[PDB]
Each structure stands twice: as C-alpha cells, then as structure tokens.
C-alpha cells in the first residue's frame, strides 16, 4: 500500500504579514522523513525544509517545519510577496516516494461578482464555417465560478471552451472567458443565446443574452 | 556539496508513438541517487524512476531510466497522450536535494498563425472599475507569441494582462487573450485601439484595430 499524503488546504487565501500553516497528513507512519518543497512561477522546485524540522542552507528564518502525531506542518511566520507560490510535502520513509496534492498560496480579497459581457460572433468569422459566441466574466473573487450556456432556453454543454486567468497581481481578482464554438449552420438554426454565471456573491445566477 | 542539475531540453515537441529522451547533467557526481518525477497539469507529482534505472510500482514499461557518466536520461519508448506533461530530475546524493529546470512535453503539429479578434469594452465595464479592451489570438502554434498594444499609434506598456490556454486536446494548438485595462477617462480621451502580434508564422506583425 502506497503512503498517501493529504495536504491541507488545496488553496490557502492569506494577506502579507499573516502567519500561515500548511498541513500534510501521512496515511502510515513516516517518522521524521518528510521534506517541504516550493515551486516558483518559472516552474523550478526547491527544498525549504527536510527531516520534518530542518531548514536547508539559505532558506529564510520565517519558514519552519513541525510534526504533531501524523500531521506535518510547514509554517510561514510572516508572509512576503515571493511566498504566494505552490508548496508540496514529500515523504521518503517508504518506496515509492509520494507527494501531497500541493497548496497554492493565494492573496485574500473581498468577494467580487463577475462583470459579465456576451459578444455575438464576427461577420468575417460568420461567412467562414465557424460561429463562436464569447462570454467574458471579469474581476470576480473567489476563483470558484460556474458558467451555463442556454440556446432558446435550453442548456448546451458541448462545444464550450473555458479559459481562466491566474490571480491578478494588481487587484487580486480572477477573470475568465467561456466560448460557445459552433457552426454557421447551427448558429443561424437558433435565435436566443445566454451564458448564465453562478458565483458565491449571488444567491441567483447572473445572466447575459442577445437574439437576432 | 550544493549540486546543479542541467535539464535538456526545456521544451520538447513530439507525436504519439515517438521515442523521446530527457537528459539531466549533474555538476558533481551523485552516483545512482537520481529520481525522475512527473507533474500533471493539476500540479500532482509522481515518482516514475528511482536510483537512476528502477521503475516504481505500477509505472508503465515504456518509461526507462539510464545514466552515462554524470548525464542521467529518462526515455519514453513510445509516447501516449497522458505522457505530454512536465518531467523533473531530482538528486538526493547531497543536501540540499536539487531538481532540474523541468521539461514540458507538448504534441508536435504544423505551425499555425493566430486568428486575431478585438472586443471593445461594455458600457457596464467602462463605468465600473476597469475599462478593458480584449484581444483574442486563437489556434496558433507554437505557444511562443508577443502582443503589443497601441493607442492612436502610441504603444501602451502597463495595464496589459496576457493569458495562455494549455495545448488544445482536439487540434494541439494554443490560444491566448491580451487584456488592456484602462480608466474610463483614458479610454474616451482616445479613439484608435490596436493589438499587434509577433508570431513565427508571420514575416510581419498581425494587427487588429477598432475606432470610435
């Protein structure tokens, strides 16, 4: 049986100067044999902490590692802007070596509803095969959101491409585009087009629509 | 001894059933103490190979690890669709443990020029926080692309967010949005807005504009 490391939380929202802890629970005893890794935006992975508690050379003092039973914690005493990256626990007590799911440090922000814009497809696009209806969802928080597409009241699930931004460095919000990619034929078959957005900040969905 | 692992190549394009090799050169002797990791797009990390040559339990036979002096190689004999992810070498011969820069496998395809679409901001958007001009660059390959913004012929450098999609599973292309955030005042000061793209597949830059 592979040792499973349950990493808490998956996403952690905090502010500059906050004290935060990442927890990593081992499914079987690994003793002191846990390392803490950091993955930078350039994709590079470093080891911060080894053997549960020990700081690697050059690692800032604000990083510290502890163990409470089968729960291993990385603690950052006072968060800095460089620290809002991905973190992984790694156990090397047993083969195979296994990693936690990871923890993304994210900047905590007041909840924001998305500004929703719906654009019908271009005349240039339309005369060639394709018809893409684009739905913009701008500057919402938190990241968790849902977009439905409706054609003449009826939900359409397929032919939909969703693209998210990372957290905005300026205002700490998320944006996303949903594209309902379609044929010229299909588009002119139906009349009414609606993307509806479901977010924490509204008990009922935000709807944007158009016809011909 | 603090050991540098030089990983080749940084990016690797190949097709289904192709044989590929990753190299990882150690700056100092690490003996057989090198592991090969796989990172899934969701950020999950597995160990495929340990102690240079050994396959971890359940790892497919098409993965193989070898060493030629201080050069350590991961070979995938016949690529499958699940295999087009990130790979890292990891040495544990010396403290601190160090990783290679990484290697992203992508699916090779014919070079594609982006289709450029420009969306002016909504009235709702324009009054409320950011007034966003959005420039879509669709179904281009390779992923590397550069997008400038011009306002009435003058280049705008700040208030621009550039966001990539992962490689499309259907057609192996990349898409990309460039968002020029602007003040309500700034926007209605000027009339002409232009995103201009530099890509391999165009000898000259790709231009989209609109006026008021």
Rounded-to-integer distance, Cα B110 and Cα B61, Å: 30
A116 and A135 in contact (C-beta within 8 Å)?
yes
Paired tokens of B49: 């190979």
B177 and chain A: CB distance < 8 Å anywhere?
A: yes
Q: Which of B122, B131, B158, B173 to mutate to test the interface with A (most CBs of A within 10 A)?
A: B122
Distance of CA A189 to the CA centre of its chain: 36
Strands B174-182 and B160-164, sheet pairing: antiparallel
Rounded-to-integer distance, Cα A68 and Cα A61, Å: 21
**Best CA proximity match to A121, nearest among A133, A107, A136:** A133
Rounded-to-integer distance, Cα B212 and Cα B210, Å: 7
Rounded-to-integer distance, Cα A24 and Cα A70, Å: 8
The CA-atom distances, in angstroms, between A8 and each of A76, A84, A104, A184, B45 are 15, 15, 10, 47, 16
Tell me how crowded residue A182 is: count the other CB atoms within 10 A of its CB: 23
Domains of chain B, earliest start first: 5-107 (2.60.40.10), 115-210 (2.60.40.10)
DSSP letter assigned to residue A141: B
- Which 70-109 residues of chain B touch chain A by CB within 8 A? 86, 88, 92, 95-99, 101-102
Residue contact B2–A95, C-beta within 8 A: no
Chain A / chain B CB contacts < 8 angstroms: 92
Tell me how crowded residue B148 is: count the other CB atoms within 10 A of its CB: 17
Rounded-to-integer distance, Cα B104 and Cα B9, Å: 8
Q: Residue-wise over B188-197: b if at least 16 C-beta within 10 A, else e? A: eeeeebbbbb
Residue entry with tokens 């990256």? A85
For this entry, resolution in Å reads 2.8
Tell which phi-psi region holds residue A191, choosing left (phi > 0), alpha (psi between -120 and 50) or beta.
Answer: alpha
**Best CA proximity match to B68, nearest among B11, B97, B26, B102:** B26
A113 and chain B: CB distance < 8 Å anywhere?
A: no
DSSP letter assigned to residue A2: P
Which residues 6+ apart lie within 8 Å of A30 measured at CB?
A: A3, A91, A93, A94
**Torsion (CA) B52, B57, B61, B67 in degrees, nearest 10:** 0
Residue entry with tokens 């901001």? B121
Residue contact A44–B2, C-beta within 8 A: no
Q: How was this structure determined?
A: X-ray
Rounded-to-integer distance, Cα B134 and Cα B117, Å: 8
User: Nearest 5°: CA angle at B156, between B151 and B160?
Assistant: 115
Paired tokens of B36: 């090969």
Paired tokens of B166: 């992962």
Sign of CA dihedral A43, A14, B166, B196: negative
Rounded-to-integer distance, Cα A36 and Cα A23, Å: 11
Which H or E element spans position A49?
strand A45-50
């Amino acid at each position: 049986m592979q040792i499973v490391l349950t990493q808490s939380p998956s996403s952690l929202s905090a502010s500059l100067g906050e004290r935060v802890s990442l927890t990593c629970r081992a499914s079987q005893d690994i003793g002191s044999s846990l390392n803490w890794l950091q993955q930078e935006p350039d994709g590079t992975i470093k080891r911060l902490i080894y053997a549960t508690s020990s700081l690697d050379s050059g690692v800032p003092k604000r990083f510290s590692g502890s163990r409470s039973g089968s729960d291993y914690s990385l603690t950052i005493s006072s968060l800095e802007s460089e620290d809002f990256v991905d973190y992984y626990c790694l156990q090397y007590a047993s083969s195979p070596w296994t990693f936690g799911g990871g923890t993304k440090l994210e900047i905590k922000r007041a909840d924001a509803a998305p500004t929703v814009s719906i654009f019908p497809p271009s005349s240039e696009q339309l005369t060639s095969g394709g018809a893409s209806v684009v739905c913009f969802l701008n500057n919402f928080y938190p990241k968790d959101i849902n977009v439905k597409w409706k054609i003449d009241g009826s939900e359409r699930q397929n032919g939909v491409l969703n693209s998210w931004t990372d957290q905005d460095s300026k205002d700490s919000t998320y944006s996303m585009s949903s594209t309902l990619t379609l044929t010229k034929d299909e588009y002119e078959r139906h009349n009414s087009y609606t993307c509806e957005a479901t977010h924490k900040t509204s008990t009922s969905p935000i709807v944007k629509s158009f016809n011909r």
